[PDB]
Specification:
The chain is α/β, with parallel strands linked by helices. The chain has helices spanning 2-16, 24-36, 50-56, 77-81, 109-120, 153-156, 171-178, 197-207, 214-229, 238-253, 276-292, 297-317, 372-381, 428-449, 459-479, and strands at residues 39-43, 66-70, 98-102, 123-125, 130-132, 137-142, 161-164, 327-328, 338-339, 349-360, 363-371, 386-389, 395-397, 399-402, 408-411, 417-421. It is elongated and about 115 Å long. The chain binds adenosine-5'-diphosphate. Adenosine-5'-diphosphate binds next to helix 3. Its EC number is 3.6.1.-.
Amino acid sequence: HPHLLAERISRLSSSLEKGLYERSHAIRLCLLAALSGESVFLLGPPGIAKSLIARRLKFAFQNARAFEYLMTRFSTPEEVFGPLSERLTSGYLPEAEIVFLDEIWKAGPAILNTLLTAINERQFRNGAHVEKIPMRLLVAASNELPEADSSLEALYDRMLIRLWLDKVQDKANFRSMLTSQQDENDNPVPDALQVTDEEYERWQKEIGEITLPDHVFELIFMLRQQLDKLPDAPYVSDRRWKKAIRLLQASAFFSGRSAVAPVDLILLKDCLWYDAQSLNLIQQQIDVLMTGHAWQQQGMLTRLGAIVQRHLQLQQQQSDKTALTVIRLGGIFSRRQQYQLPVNVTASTLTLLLQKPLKLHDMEVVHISFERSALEQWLSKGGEIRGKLNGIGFAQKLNLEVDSAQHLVVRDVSLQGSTLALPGSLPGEIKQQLEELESDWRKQHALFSEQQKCLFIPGDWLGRIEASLQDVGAQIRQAQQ
Ligand SMILES: Nc1ncnc2c1ncn2[C@@H]1O[C@H](COP(=O)(O)OP(=O)(O)O)[C@@H](O)[C@H]1O
């Protein structure tokens, strides 16, 4: 039933989107805002359908009056809210469900103040008595952002969603928009889809009942702390956070869920920035949160390395079972030449464990990886041989010698020797742990795919998450070989 809802909202949004190019997200967000009692600020140059998409949204509702107004510096509350005879509000802001106000940052202090009470109190001072405004969606537009310490910032910071728009970029889209016979002022929404007053009011109550899971909160709180520590990060007030949380709830509700999901958190990318520099910072931070923490990605990778560590540890604990017998090569040469095993060892770079781990280059080393090519020439021509300690870092020079028993022995600064062994020809402890992790990964991936079907999230983000989960899965599958 709420799953028929996700179907309906999607179908509703689809129709509202007809004839509009490169504005999909913007329409879904304004719909989400309109259905959740939030407001949205549209930033961009003139003639890019900012007003149009605002007028479009009145067609989401059966009974919905729209109010449009362009702010001038000489604009008075009489023009915006109605002139008093007590006040004549018919055809003005005080009785419209969708209000669009263009060129917002030039509203005077008198308008500014009565707007702030309009957004907060959903009330209006009608001379004598105060009356509740039916305003469901407010949308404000401008080509610029308000001044640094402006009066208007209080208004800006009271408008949850921020969208930065531009002229159509795709050549094909330009042509389609250019030749579109779509009457832009006609109702494109089928009667059945339009939301009723009875529905609107019920949903307002139900959105508040959507739960906020522990992991979801932890992520939000993590980001709040993260932003705080970064000096460039925009200041996000508690007011902003609370209003952002309702949008998150609304997203979930209209996506057929009873709980805010980690995917809903992407929407914060449309709430937390106030300028250009802060937009980039927000996007990066949320991206890091989404690809790293939201589906336990980095947490599973830190578990993975812990297992791979144990695997190596068990590999060197069973390194008595193996040594490495270098085969003598005869012929006619000046040195006692040596040879690697014909095809037994053919790995381009092979790693060798040591029976007695040694302190080499101020660290204890359990395994040394050689470029097989470099080990060849040293076994033949002698000289000096390098090898990356514990597989990592630079190829360090080594005190290596061919043993009488035909083994390879590394020495430390105490001249302590250690025989080198090749890895085993998968232990039960590792198989158990690595299967638990794979199960956990599958459960994570399952959760993501079962929730990525979310109207209010742009496709590109979902791509990045899916990739980040594939990365972990690939790393674990390579670990079980
Ligand atoms: N991205 C777009 N998609 C569809 N139509 C557009 C787009 N950009 C501009 N238009 C056209 O421009 C007009 C709407 O512009 P308008 O609402 O005045 O924009 P703004 O409010 O940003 O000045 C319509 O006639 C519409 O067909």
